Amino acid sequence: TGLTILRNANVYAPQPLGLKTVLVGGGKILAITDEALELPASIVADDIDLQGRILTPGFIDAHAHITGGGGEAGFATQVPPVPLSQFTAFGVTTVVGLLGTDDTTRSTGNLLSRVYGLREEGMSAYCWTGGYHYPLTTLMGSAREDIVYMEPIIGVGEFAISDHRSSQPQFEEVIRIASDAHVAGLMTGKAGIVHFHLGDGSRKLALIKRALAETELPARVFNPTHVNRNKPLFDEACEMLSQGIYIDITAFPDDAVDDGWSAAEALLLAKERGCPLKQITISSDGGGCMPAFAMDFGRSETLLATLKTVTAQGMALEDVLSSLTANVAHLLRLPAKGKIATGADADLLVLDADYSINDVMALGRWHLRDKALIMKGTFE
Amino acid sequence: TGLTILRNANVYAPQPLGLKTVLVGGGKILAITDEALELPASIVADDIDLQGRILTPGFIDAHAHITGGGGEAGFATQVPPVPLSQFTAFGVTTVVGLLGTDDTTRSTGNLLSRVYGLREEGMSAYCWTGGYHYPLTTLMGSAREDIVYMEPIIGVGEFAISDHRSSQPQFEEVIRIASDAHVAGLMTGKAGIVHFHLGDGSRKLALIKRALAETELPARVFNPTHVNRNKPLFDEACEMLSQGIYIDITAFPDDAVDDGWSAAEALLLAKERGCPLKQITISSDGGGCMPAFDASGAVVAMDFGRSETLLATLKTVTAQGMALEDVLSSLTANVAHLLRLPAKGKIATGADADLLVLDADYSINDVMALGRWHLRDKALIMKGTFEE
Amino acid sequence: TGLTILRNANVYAPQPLGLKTVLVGGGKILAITDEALELPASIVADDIDLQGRILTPGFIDAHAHITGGGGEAGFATQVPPVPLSQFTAFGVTTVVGLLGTDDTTRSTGNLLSRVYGLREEGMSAYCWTGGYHYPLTTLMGSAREDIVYMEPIIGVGEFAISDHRSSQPQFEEVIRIASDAHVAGLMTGKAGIVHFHLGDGSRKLALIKRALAETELPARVFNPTHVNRNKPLFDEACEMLSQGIYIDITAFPDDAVDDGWSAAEALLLAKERGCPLKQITISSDGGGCMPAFAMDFGRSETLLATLKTVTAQGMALEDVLSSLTANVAHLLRLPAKGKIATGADADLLVLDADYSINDVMALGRWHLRDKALIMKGTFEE
Amino acid sequence: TGLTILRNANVYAPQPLGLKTVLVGGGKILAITDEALELPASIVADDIDLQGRILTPGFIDAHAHITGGGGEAGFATQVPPVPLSQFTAFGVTTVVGLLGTDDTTRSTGNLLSRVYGLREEGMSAYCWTGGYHYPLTTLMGSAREDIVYMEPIIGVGEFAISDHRSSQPQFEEVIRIASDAHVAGLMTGKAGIVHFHLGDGSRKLALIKRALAETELPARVFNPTHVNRNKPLFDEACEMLSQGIYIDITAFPDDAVDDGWSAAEALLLAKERGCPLKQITISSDGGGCMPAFAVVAMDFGRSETLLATLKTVTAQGMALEDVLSSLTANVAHLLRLPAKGKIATGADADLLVLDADYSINDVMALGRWHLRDKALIMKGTFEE
Ligand SMILES: [Zn+2]
Ligand SMILES: [Zn+2]
Ligand SMILES: [Zn+2]
Ligand SMILES: [Zn+2]
Ligand SMILES: [Zn+2]
Ligand SMILES: [Zn+2]
Ligand SMILES: [Zn+2]
Ligand SMILES: [Zn+2]
C-alpha cells in the first residue's frame, strides 16, 4: 500500500553513485536523492536505514529452464519446474525461460504458462520461443508470430549450433530464423535476438561469422551462450566482440567446468584481454540437468558465487554486477530492469560487505528480509 | 517521475467518500486520506488543490471497435482505427476492443496489435476474441487458447444472437463457446465471459435462458449487450437480472435510438423497476459505423460512434435525479467487477491511477491514465502518434 | 539378480489365503506354497521371515495427476510432477495418470513422457488420453489412435460431465468417444473405457443412463469417478451398479469432503446397502490441486488412511483391499496386477498389525524396507 | 509356471563359458553356475539335461519385412506377413521390422501393429520408422516423435542411398534425419540410429563419409546394410569401420549374391583383413521379395540364411563365438537392447540349443519353448 524508504543505501546502479535515499512505491523507484526525505508516517509502509550497505538491481538470469530441463538421458531425467525461491533467494528478480534439448515432450505452452505462474507469484519472467531443434517449437505457427503477439516472448532460443544434439542447421536456416527474430523485435520493442546454445563442435561460431560477413543483420541479433565451455570457443567469442555481438558466459558449478573456464575465470580473462565488458553477460542455466560421474539440476546460486569469486580477485563490483544486470537489460531491451534509476521497476538486492544477499525486493515487495524468505512459491 | 498529490478531492470511488487527499505515484493510487499530507517539494511533480471538485475513476468502455468497425454496407464504410484522444478526451482510460459484423477482412491480429498500440500510447486496453460469426475468428486455433495465452484477451465477443447478420448459432454451439471462455477465465483470473450482440429478433435472449436452465455455467458468463435496442428485449434483460446475468446498455446517440430506449432512459427505467443496478453496465460502441439521414430518410453522410455518449448519458440521468454514484458505477466499478479487472474502476489504494476531475455540471476537466495527465484544464497533453 | 523368498506371509491375495511361502524372481511371483522351500544359498538374494505379517498386492491408483494438476485458479496453481516416493512410500506400485481441468497448457506428450519416467524409476504406470474437455487432447489425431498404438494408454479420461468446467458435452459426442475407447480396448486387450469426472451438476449420471438405455455399449465402458462428492450423486451411482457400471470413489482428505462422503464413509455405506463391492474402486486424485479456506496437492497417503478407517469400523481387510487392487486390475484389464498369484508381477506390501506399511516391493525390487526408502525419484533428496 | 533348469549347457554367451547350469524364471536368466542346483520339485516346471549341447542367445534379426515386403514389380508381388514360426524355427527370438521400397501402400501403423502381433504370440519385436523414401513415412508427424513416444520404434530405416529406387536424398536431408534419430535415442535409451539401404550406385557411402567428416554426430548413428552386395562397396564399408560405424551384412541366399559376397564370404574376408568384428552384424532381409530366374517364379527371404551362414563360416575355421556375436551381442550392443544377445543373469531367456553340426534343436523365447527336439510347440495364430 504505502511508500518504502531506503536510507543511506550505498547505491550500485550498477555504477557506484554513493549514499542515497531511495523511495519505492507502486512497484517502481520514485526517487534517488541526497536529501534525508521527511514523509508523513501515515503513507510509509517501511522506513529502513541500510546504514551504508550496498543496494543493487536484482539479477536478470536470461538462461533458465523454468519448466525444468533434462530428458537427455532417459525420461526419468526430466527436471521439475524451478520453485520461485530458487530464483529470488539467489537475487534473481527477472528470469528468461527456455526449452533445451527436450523441445519434443515440452512445448512453448508449458514454458509460457510457467512464465505467467512466476509473474503471479511476484517475480518478473520472459521466455525464448523456438527451442533447440529445427523446425522450431513455437506456440503459434512461427517464431515471428510468437514474438509479435505474446508479450513475454522476446526472441528465439536456445537454438543449438556446433553440437551433436543440434539439428545440423544450415546457414540459410539460421539467417532466416535471425531475420524473423529481428523483425519481430523491431515491431514490438523487444530483444529481437537468437540465443544460440554452443556445443564443443570444432566449427565453433562459423555460422555466426558467415552471417556477420554476408548479411545486413545487426551483430547484436547473434547471441552465443556457453562460450566458456572450451578455450578455443571462448577465444573466438572474445575476438567477435569487436564485431558487436554480445556473449553469454555460463556460471557452471566447479564440477561441470571440464576443459573450459568457470564464469569467474572467463570474465577475469575478458577484462585482462581488454574486451568490451558491456557486451558480456552471465547466466546460470538454472533447472538444467547436472549429472555426477547421481543426478541434480543447475541453480541461480552460481551467479552470486561468481560475483564473490571475481571481486575477491580484485575486479570492481560494478564490472561483474553489470554482467548480471544492466548489460542483460540493454541487450534484451528491458528498460525497466537492470538499473537503479527513477521510473525503473523496484527490483533491488541489499548486500552485506562480503556481497552475501541480506534482502531481495521484487516489484516493490520483500521476498527475502534479513536472509529469511518472506514470500515463496505456491507449493514450497 | 515524482509524486502527484490531489488535495481536497470530492471522491466518488465511485461511492461518495467525501473530501480526501489522493496521492499518486508509479502509476498507482498510493494513499487516500483525510490528512493534509506534507511532502518534500523535491519528490512532488504536481501539487494540485481540487478545492472540492469531484474525482472519479476513469471510464471502462467494454464495447469499442478500436480497429474501426463498419464494412456492413460496402468496403468504403470501413471505419479508421479510433485515435487515442477519441477515448481519453471523453474520460475513457480503459477500452475493451472487439470485431463486429466484419470479422472476415479484420482479424484478431489486427485487434490485438491495436490493443498494444493503445497501451504504448499510455491508456489501458483489452480485447474480446472470436467476433460475431461462427466459426469464431481467433488468433490461435481456438478461443480457449487465445484467452489462456494472450494476456489482453479476456473473453469471447461480440457474438451475435437474434440478428439477421448472425451465423444462426445453435444452443449446443453457444454453450460450447461459453464453456471455453469460462474455463480460460478460471485458468487466468480474467473475465472468462461471452459478450453477446443482440439484434431485433423476436427470440430475444431465448438461447441464454436455455443455457441458464440446462447448464451449470454461472449466469455472469452470459453478458448480452444492446439490450436497450427494443423494449421487449429490454424487459426480458431486466427480468433475467434476478438470475445473476450482467446486462450492457449501449449509449446510442439520440438519432439511432429508433424503437428502443436511450442508455439514459434504460438506466432510469431499471432503477424505477428496482433492478440490481450493480449488474448493469453502459458502453459506447465507439468506432461503430454511424449513418446520417436527411428529412426524406435518404443516407446523406457517414460518421462513427464516439465514447462522448458515456458522459452525455451520465449528465442526462443525473439531471433526472439519479445519484452520480449509480450511473458512475455502470461506467466504472460494475464493469471492473464483471471483467475481473481489480486494478480498474475504483479510487482505492493499490488501484491504477486512472482518474477524472469533473466540473460541477460533470464536464470533464482533467483525465489521468496510469498516473499521467492526458487532459489538463480541457487541453490535450498526450495524443495518438498520428493525431494533429 | 537372485530369488527373494518371503516365509510365513499372511497372504491377502487380496482374498485371505492364510500363511504361505512366496517366491519372487525375474520381477514375478514364481510360487505361493505351504512348503518351507529349501533353496541353494547361491541363487537367493533375500531370505525373509515375515513372521505372520500381512502380505498384500501393491495398490493401483487409477486417478493421479502424475504431471501435477491444478492451473484452475491461476497459472501459479500448476502442481509440480509427483515424485516416485509420493506413490511407492504409500503402497502405490501402479499409477494411471491423467490430465484434468488444464488440458490446454498440459499435453498428452507431457503425460506419456512422465509415465515412461516413472517406469524408468521402477514403478508401473499407465495413462488416460483425451482429458477433460471436447475436443479431446490426444498425442495422435484421435483417442482411438492413441489407445491402439501407445501401449501405456488404456482409455479416455478424465472426461468431465455435470460440471461448470465441462465442455457441456452432448449425448452424441459422449457415445462416439465411448465407442472409440471400447473398439481400441477390444483391438489391444486394454481397458477400453471412459473415466468420467463428475461435478456437482444436478443432471448427475443422466448422460450415462441414456448411453446404457439407447446403445449396445457394455456398461463397464462408463466409469464415473468422484461419485462420493455429493450425496444425491452417490445414491444414483450405487443404484446404477445393478446395470453393471464400475464406480470410482475418491479418497478426499477430511477437509475437502464438503457436502459428500469420505471414501471410507462411502464404501461402508455401499456395503450396508448390499451394493456389489467388486464394482467399486478407490483412487486418491494424487497431484490434484487442494485449496485451503493456502495451496497443497492430493497424496496417495489417503488410500491406506481409508483402509485403516473402514477396517476400524468392522469392514473385512479383503473388501477394502480389493477396491485398491483386484477390482481396479479387473476393470482396467491388467492381468499381471492387483493379485498375489503365480505369474503376476511382484508388486507387494508388507503391513504391520495396525495396517501401517512396513515394506513395498515393485517388480521384485524393494522400494521401502522397514519404513526406510531404498529407492527414490531421480531428483528426490 | 515356476522355474526351468538347464543342466550341462555348453554355454556360448556368445563367448565360450564352458559347462554351466542355467536357471530360468519369470522370462529371465536367474543364474548361470558351476553348481548342480538342487531345487524343490514343486517349483520346477522343467528339469532338462542338455548333455553338453551348445546353448546360445537367440538371434536378433535387425532387418526383416515383418509385414511382408515386395510390391517392387507389381501389386501381386506384395509378400504376406511373415508367420511367427518363420522366425522362431530359424533361431530368431527378436526381430526388428522395417518398410522397404513400398512405403506408399504400407504404413508405419501396419508395421507397428505387426510388432504388437508378434509380441502377443510370444517373441520380441521392434521396428524402424521412416522407411526408404523422403519425405519419411512415420506414424506421428515426424521420426523424432515416433522414436520418442512409441516404445518399439528404435530408429529410422531402411533409408535408401546410392540406389535408383532412392529419393536421391541430399547431404543436408540425411544429417537432419540422423540428428532426429540420435536425439530421440538419447532421450529414450534406444538405438537412435539410421539404418541405410545401400544400392549398387558408384557413390557408395559418400553421404556417410561427408556426415562423419563435417558433423559432430557419433559414427554409430550411420548404419549401412547390404554392404556385401558389391565388392567395391564392401571394401569401402570395411575401411570405414576404423571411424566407428557398424556395418550390416545381408545373408542373401546363394542365387541372389550376383557380383557381391555371401554373408559367409564377407565375414571371413573381414576377419582375414583384421577388421573389428564387434562392429559387424548379419541380418536376413526375411519377408523381402526374392525373384527366381527370364523372371520365372517368386519367393520371399527367410531367416534360415542366418544359421546357414554360421554353418558355412564355422566349416571354414571361424570360431563359433565370432559369427554368433554378429547375430547376437553385436546387434544388442548397437541397438541398445541390454536384455538381448547375451547369456547373462538378468537378461531375457531367449536361448537356442544347437546340435554338434550347429542345427537348431530347441528355441526358447522369454522363458517359453517355441521349438523342442526340432518340433514346433508354439506357432502363429493362423499357422496350420
Ligand atoms: Zn545449452
Ligand atoms: Zn541449457
Ligand atoms: Zn453489436
Ligand atoms: Zn458493435
Ligand atoms: Zn482429478
Ligand atoms: Zn476430477
Ligand atoms: Zn530390404
Ligand atoms: Zn534394402
Residue numbers in the entry:
A (entry chain D): 2 to 294, 302 to 388
B (entry chain C): 2 to 389
C (entry chain E): 2 to 294, 302 to 389
D (entry chain F): 2 to 294, 299 to 389
From the study:
Cyanophycin is a bacterial biopolymer used for storage of fixed nitrogen. First, cyanophycinase breaks down the backbone peptide bonds, releasing β-Asp-Arg dipeptides. Then, these dipeptides are broken down into free Asp and Arg by enzymes with isoaspartyl dipeptidase activity. Two bacterial enzymes are known to have significant β-aspartyl dipeptidase activity: isoaspartyl dipeptidase (IadA), a bacterial zinc metallopeptidase; and isoaspartyl aminopeptidase (IaaA, also called plant-type asparaginase, EcAIII and IadC), a common Ntn-family enzyme with known plant and animal homologs.
